[PDB]
Design a protein around this nucleic acid. Structure first.
Ligand SMILES: [K+]
Ligand SMILES: [K+]
Ligand SMILES: [K+]
Ligand SMILES: [K+]
Ligand SMILES: [K+]
Ligand SMILES: [K+]
Ligand SMILES: [K+]
Ligand SMILES: [K+]
Ligand SMILES: [K+]
Ligand SMILES: [K+]
Ligand SMILES: [Mg+2]
Ligand SMILES: [Mg+2]
Length: 1316
RNA sequence: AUAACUCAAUUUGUAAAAAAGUUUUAGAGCUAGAAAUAGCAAGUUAAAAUAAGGCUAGUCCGUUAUCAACUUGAAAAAGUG
DNA sequence: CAATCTCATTTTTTACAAATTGAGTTAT
DNA sequence: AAATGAGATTG
């Protein structure tokens, strides 16, 4: 009747337990339903729910967005064919028909098999003339002869079907012609500005060096290499870098203490440059114009590779170039191999599986695997010297459709499209009339802020229609309301003001919002001088002066400025003490200065009659990021500023939204005062009151006005939490588990509920170092190349994050010496349990940090500080890591800070865990007392994993996860015991552990020793522990430790695997070649995979038991069957719509509809000798038994795998090994039934008896994946690998016992499937 | 424990785009020889599909979340030891 | 039939909002 | 980025 619940919440598991007064877990009889022998069964109230991980919405999103791209790319083609339809009907009757049936085999085609012209002779002639589609592109662009309308279409459709990216705004007009003159012009102006010293043009071939196919870095090096007395870091070097598209830094050139780095493709270039030019003088302007002018002709040299005077199609020409070089070097490679390597010619040019040229063209061999495979052959032969040059440039034998085309801007494909239309519109009138439309098909792009063009049936769409019409690319601006749509894009996601829920939050950069932040900070600033007795607030007149003089002149306001530029200058204090702010004010009037630079009118920003306009301008600048719409929205104010000011305001853009509403900060008014919140922050007289105070002061009316403005389900609520969907899945299951236990306990609520919650990309790592190293100017990657997969090594990863340098000592490290170095916790592990890179460092020896009990010492901080700064700016360390490193210069860890960490080790602060406790508390405590305050009948306790974990080590209740899943349940039992014991012993700690509403050393010691009441001797305490005030019993060393052992020793624990209908993709995505088989699924209704190939390995949503008849033999005599049919995800909707018809089509007859049993994945069946199986599929099974190993063996394995008194227990009881093997064998021979594997285990074990007991025990732990629950898996015992033994027949299940389990497993209905 | 602000890191969710990959077909293979089979010539490109499909017919929707059994329900979830 | 081997779509860009953690300032 | 449900091939 009196019980508490323990809960262990994980991403894949929820353990649960029920305990009584004396920490015993009850044992109850439960009714068994079904048609079986048993009418009931006894179960212990300890168990654990297992389940597959909850997934994010990401993959579904990526598939959904890809979906929409494919359909819109198709609509592009359709739009184009609709423009061509009438005039093509006169040239070729069925052209567009042959194109769309091009995929069909000749047997299924309506028209002749050759798509373009419809006859061998003309089709063979076409490929002779245009071996690639780019041969046709170029000719159609450059030639002036009338072209076949079918060839015009193909050219435009190819350009429209693959249009390139949209990452560059505006238009490009390739000009590769003037690089030599433009470079000479840059060197020219530079030498005009630096007359003391010039650069020499020197006939340097800039075109070749800068247009060569290397990275921008190399082309820079080669360029300055040809310049004597110059360096790549020097001014001219950093200019060449910018002209190449790089981001250089110019501060060290001009003696600037402020970083000046420019990127010509970044939208902030013009203003960044303005800052630089305002600092260094505008006589340097022409120097950057030359860099930009050279940048325009060199921009796309990466892709063009051709002079733009021969053609208007430098891309296609570049493509044709790839082809011709592929041709020559292929002829040349063939000859060579014949002469010098004839015996290898077959492998290279014929065998499709070898990654040769045949594998390259006809196989699945990528450019990289081809090059890798043919690298030795070339450098082995002679006469191949230039092919190796082409290979290192990745230019050897190149296709035209390649992974690296992603750099091509759509503006290029547009150029060629435009040219083709210009030539042939002379001959075809309709191409003239529709020249606009066609270009628009390639050009148009749904703006990301419009979203899907739905009509009321899209859960993802927000866009609004300016008129009810079909949206096309040509009527988009007129039919779609872009302004209202761009608004909803933001507003459907923005927060309302929690204080005023009917009001939108202000932009973060709103002038009003920043006045609020400055005053709210200023109003609690206090000051003292010599004369005065107390520190005093700032008055109204003082703040206004501080704002007008400092905040409206300085971007940031330092305390030094406050003391010198206000207190000294205006109040004549040689010295003053400031409280309430440190070093400088956090708040600032940034937008005030942003606009001051643009509108150059200070009296405009200070004029209060402009407040509304300025607030609407900054709202516009935040809501919209499309500068074409910003301009349209600022037009109304175009009369208040000149043209150039509006131009600048266009580009001013903000992001972010505040926490509060305009009405809250200003709108609302105090009835007595008539002042708004901001009025009080400006002037409140003597008491200078916070926003917090203003909102909670019962003397003012703000609180009541707010309070009267305020205003679901378990599943929606949990889904709306912030956190991993995986952990949310466990949260929901935890509530459902508790509901059932309460019901099991007769609807009596627990006394306590104790809950505990548990806590990979190499590409990101490689990206981190590449960026930081590049930003750091270090050669460590050229000197010590790396591969992402290597960086999963902890020490190697740090080594590169620290630029191959000791983090504490200022000396190099040796990659070959990592094993001799130390990983060290910045803030010692004994305080903060932090495993991440943020708290870790690689140093030669951990002794050099300093004292072990603290942050790295002052000495080290001094020596290394500047070096950590560089790592910070290179983003190789985070601010968190940096601030921790330096803390010693702030006194290191104070005694208070230490005590803080130790209690954070046992007291849970995580928000997600607090939500779990609040959910439980609100479901358990629903009643209110006579004073209308909540009655807390159930106390919800939350514990960190450390308490039970330490409890296990201390008292040797050891845990080994690999043996079975019982530990999930044991942890929950131990949570309830410990959690109830603590609150029973220290009822004052209710505030810390229970949900609801000099000394530092004592705090440290106290929390550090909190768990000693369990022990008899601490390095003494009575055998019977009790609480002081009540005298009640909490812990009894005599009987209670034994009860825990009895519980952890129980063989029967309810480990339930949640059955789940499988969802997601229909099958694997790969499209297999045609095959004579019924395994392949058609990719389209009429595409028989025997002809067209298709998908394999469909996914079973659930299995169904069918008992029915099937026809057999020539005569179709009916045989009675009972079998498992897998319903695939794709078939499921049809099956549930009409189950009989579905099964009848499948061949089953006279189906017994009332015996149809739906069997999701992991359905449980028992067989002979308690042997169990779980349904993995319609044709596979998983292991359904848990092996309960005696505690004595579990504790042994733990101690053997890893004081003198426990080492002796290992040797004394060494015979346990053979007994553990015995235990596994009987289990295996009884439930696993893998005969061969069990031998190789017994054989592989017999052979390593000679090995140490440690290693032997370490690998016996491996042996348990043979007996573990669920899917079989391979494992290694020393160097012997055991292959997994799958169970790929489900026949035996059909006569076994089906077990339907409730969430706890306590309620079962068992069906004996001996029915026919 | 809460609230606003500062700096930073992380996580979740959404939209708009790009390049490949795959699959069938089209790129008249040629001499020999009855036949397999040999010898050589070739290869780089394109079309089309890219969850089967759905009705609400939109340039929309189709892979997340949620699911023991029985009784009740569209469903959520409730009722049953 | 088992045993044994084999295989699994990938990558890139832009724009945006909300939590949460954790070092700070001020407050209820 | 596994791992785990199948496919084909073998014994
Ligand atoms: K035909
Ligand atoms: K290939
Ligand atoms: K291709
Ligand atoms: K500060
Ligand atoms: K914006
Ligand atoms: K004007
Ligand atoms: K699901
Ligand atoms: K799934
Ligand atoms: K994101
Ligand atoms: K279940
Ligand atoms: Mg489709
Ligand atoms: Mg392709």
């Amino acid at each position: 009747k009196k019980y508490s619940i323990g809960l262990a919440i994980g991403t894949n598991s929820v353990g649960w337990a029920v305990i009584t007064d004396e920490y015993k877990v009850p044992s109850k009889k439960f009714k068994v339903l079904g048609n079986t022998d048993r009418h009931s069964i006894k179960k212990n109230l300890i168990g654990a729910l297992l389940f597959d991980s909850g997934e994010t919405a990401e993959a579904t999103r990526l598939k959904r967005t890809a979906r929409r791209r494919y359909t819109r790319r198709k609509n592009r083609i359709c739009y184009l064919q609709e423009i061509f339809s009438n005039e093509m009907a006169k040239v070729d009757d069925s052209f567009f028909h042959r194109l769309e049936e091009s995929f069909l085999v000749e047997e299924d085609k309506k028209h002749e098999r050759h798509p373009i012209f419809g006859n061998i002779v003309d089709e063979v002639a076409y490929h002779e003339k245009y071996p690639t589609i780019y041969h046709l592109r170029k000719k159609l662009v450059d030639s002036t002869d009338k072209a076949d309308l079918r060839l015009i279409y193909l050219a435009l459709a190819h350009m429209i079907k693959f249009r390139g990216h949209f990452l560059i705004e505006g238009d490009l007009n390739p000009d590769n012609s003037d690089v030599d003159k433009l470079f000479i012009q840059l060197v020219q102006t530079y030498n005009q500005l630096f007359e003391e010293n010039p650069i020499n043009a020197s006939g340097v071939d800039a075109k070749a060096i800068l247009s060569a196919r290397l990275s921008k870095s190399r082309r820079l090096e080669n360029l300055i290499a040809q310049l004597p007395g110059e360096k790549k870091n020097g001014l001219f070097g950093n200019l060449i870098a910018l002209s190449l598209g790089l981001t250089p830094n110019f501060k060290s050139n001009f003696d600037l203490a402020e970083d000046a780095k420019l990127q010509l493709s970044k939208d902030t270039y013009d203003d960044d440059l303005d800052n630089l030019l305002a600092q260094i003088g505008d006589q340097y302007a022409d120097l950057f114009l030359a860099a930009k002018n050279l940048s325009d002709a060199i921009l796309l040299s990466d892709i063009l590779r051709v002079n733009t005077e021969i053609t208007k199609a430098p891309l296609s020409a570049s493509m044709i170039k790839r082809y011709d070089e592929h041709h020559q070097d292929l002829t040349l490679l063939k000859a060579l191999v014949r002469q010098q390597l004839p015996e290898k010619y077959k492998e290279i040019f014929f065998d499709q599986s070898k990654n040769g040229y045949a594998g390259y063209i006809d196989g699945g061999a990528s450019q990289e695997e081809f090059y890798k495979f043919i690298k030795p052959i070339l450098e082995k032969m002679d006469g191949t010297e230039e092919l190796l040059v082409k290979l290192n440039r990745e230019d050897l034998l190149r296709k035209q459709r390649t992974f690296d085309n992603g750099s091509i801007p759509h503006q290029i494909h547009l150029g060629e499209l435009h040219a083709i239309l210009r030539r042939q519109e002379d001959f075809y009138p309709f191409l003239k009339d529709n020249r606009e439309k066609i270009e628009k098909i390639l050009t148009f792009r749904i703006p990301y802020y419009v979203g899907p063009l739905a009509r009321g049936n899209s859960r993802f769409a927000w866009m609004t229609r300016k008129s009810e019409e079909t949206i096309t690319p040509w009527n988009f601006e007129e039919v779609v309301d872009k302004g209202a749509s761009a608004q909803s894009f933001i507003e459907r996601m923005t927060n309302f003001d929690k204080n005023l829920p009917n009001e939108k939050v202000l932009p973060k950069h709103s002038l009003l919002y920043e006045y609020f932040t400055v005053y709210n900070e200023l109003t609690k600033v206090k000051y003292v001088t010599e004369g005065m007795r107390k520190p005093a607030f700032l008055s109204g007149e003082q703040k206004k002066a501080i704002v007008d003089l400092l905040f409206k002149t300085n971007r940031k306001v330092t305390v030094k400025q406050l003391k010198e530029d206000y207190f000294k200058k205006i109040e004549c204090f040689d010295s003053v003490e400031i409280s309430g702010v440190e070093d400088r004010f956090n708040a600032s009037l940034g937008t005030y200065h942003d606009l001051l630079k643009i509108i150059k009118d200070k009296d405009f920003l200070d004029n209060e009659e402009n407040e509304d306009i300025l607030e609407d301008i900054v709202l516009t600048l935040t809501l919209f990021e499309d500068r074409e719409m910003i301009e349209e929205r600022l037009k109304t104010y175009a009369h208040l500023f000149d043209d150039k000011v509006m131009k600048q305001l266009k580009r001013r853009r903000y992001t972010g939204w505040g926490r509060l509403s305009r009405k809250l900060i200003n709108g609302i008014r105090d009835k007595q005062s008539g002042k708004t919140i901001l009025d009080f922050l400006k002037s409140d007289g003597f008491a200078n009151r916070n926003f917090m105070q203003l909102i909670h002061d019962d003397s003012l009316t703000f609180k009541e006005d707010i309070q009267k403005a305020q205003v679901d389900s378990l599943h929606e609520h949990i889904a709306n939490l912030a956190g991993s969907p995986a952990i949310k899945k466990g949260i929901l299951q935890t509530v459902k588990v508790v509901d059932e236990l309460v019901k099991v306990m007769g609807r009596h609520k627990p006394e306590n509920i104790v809950i505990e919650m548990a806590r990979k990309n190499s590409r990101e790592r490689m990206k981190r170092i590449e960026e930081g190293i590049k930003e750091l100017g270090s050669q460590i990657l050229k000197e010590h190349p790396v591969e992402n997969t290597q960086l999963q090594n902890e020490k190697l990863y740090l080594y590169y994050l620290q630029n191959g340098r000791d983090m504490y000592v200022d000396q190099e490290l040796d990659i070959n010496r990592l094993s001799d170095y130390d990983v060290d916790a910045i803030v010692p592990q004994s305080f903060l349990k932090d495993d991440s890179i943020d708290n870790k460092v690689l140093t030669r020896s951990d002794k050099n940090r300093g004292k072990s009990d603290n942050v790295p010492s002052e000495e080290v901080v001094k020596k290394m500080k500047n070096y950590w700064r560089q790592l910070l700016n290179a983003k190789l360390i985070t601010q968190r890591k940096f601030d921790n490193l330096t803390k010693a210069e702030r006194g290191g860890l104070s005694e208070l800070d230490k005590a803080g960490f130790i209690k954070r080790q046992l007291v849970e602060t995580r928000q997600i865990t607090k939500h779990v406790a609040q959910i439980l508390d609100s479901r358990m405590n629903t009643k209110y007392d006579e004073n209308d305050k909540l009655i807390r009948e159930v106390k919800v306790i939350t514990l960190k994993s450390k308490l039970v974990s330490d409890f296990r080590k201390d008292f040797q209740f050891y845990k080994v996860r690999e043996i079975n899943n019982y530990h999930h349940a044991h942890d929950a039992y131990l949570n309830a015991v410990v959690g109830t014991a603590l609150i029973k012993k220290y009822p004052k700690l209710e505030s810390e552990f229970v949900y609801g509403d000099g000394k530092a050393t004592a705090k440290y010691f106290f929390y550090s020793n909190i768990m000693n009441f369990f022990k008899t001797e601490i390095t003494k305490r009575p055998l019977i522990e009790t609480n002081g005030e009540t005298g009640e019993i909490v812990w009894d060393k005599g009987r209670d430790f034994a009860t825990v052992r009895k519980v952890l020793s129980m063989p029967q624990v309810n480990i339930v695997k949640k059955t789940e209908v499988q969802t997601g993709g229909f099958s694997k995505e790969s499209i297999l070649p045609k095959r004579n088989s019924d395994k392949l699924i058609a990719r389209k209704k009429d595409w028989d995979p025997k002809k067209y190939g298709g998908f394999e390995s469909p996914t079973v949503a659930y299995s169904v038991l069918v008992v029915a008849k099937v026809e057999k033999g020539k005569s179709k005599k009916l045989k009675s069957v009972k079998e498992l049919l897998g319903i695939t995800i794709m078939e499921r909707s049809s099956f549930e719509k009409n189950p009989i018809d579905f099964l009848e089509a499948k061949g089953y007859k006279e189906v017994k509809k009332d015996l149809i049993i739906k069997l999701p994945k992991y359905s449980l069946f028992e067989l002979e000798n308690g042997r169990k199986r779980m349904l993995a599929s319609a044709g596979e099974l998983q292991k359904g038994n848990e092996l309960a190993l005696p505690s004595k063996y579990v504790n042994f394995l733990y101690l053997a795998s890893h004081n003198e008194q426990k080492q002796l227990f290992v040797e004394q009881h060494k015979h346990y090994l053979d007994e553990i093997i015995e235990q596994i064998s009987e289990f295996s021979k009884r439930v696993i039934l893998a005969d061969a594997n069990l031998d190789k285990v017994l054989s592989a074990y017999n052979k390593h008896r000679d090995k140490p007991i440690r290693e032997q025990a370490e690998n016996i732990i491996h042996l348990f994946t043979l007996t573990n629950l669920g899917a079989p898996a391979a494992f290694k015992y020393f160097d012997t690998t055991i292959d997994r033994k799958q169970y790929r027949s489900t026949k035996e299940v059909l006569d076994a016992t089906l077990i339907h389990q409730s969430i706890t497993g306590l309620y079962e209905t068992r069906i004996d499937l001996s029915q026919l």
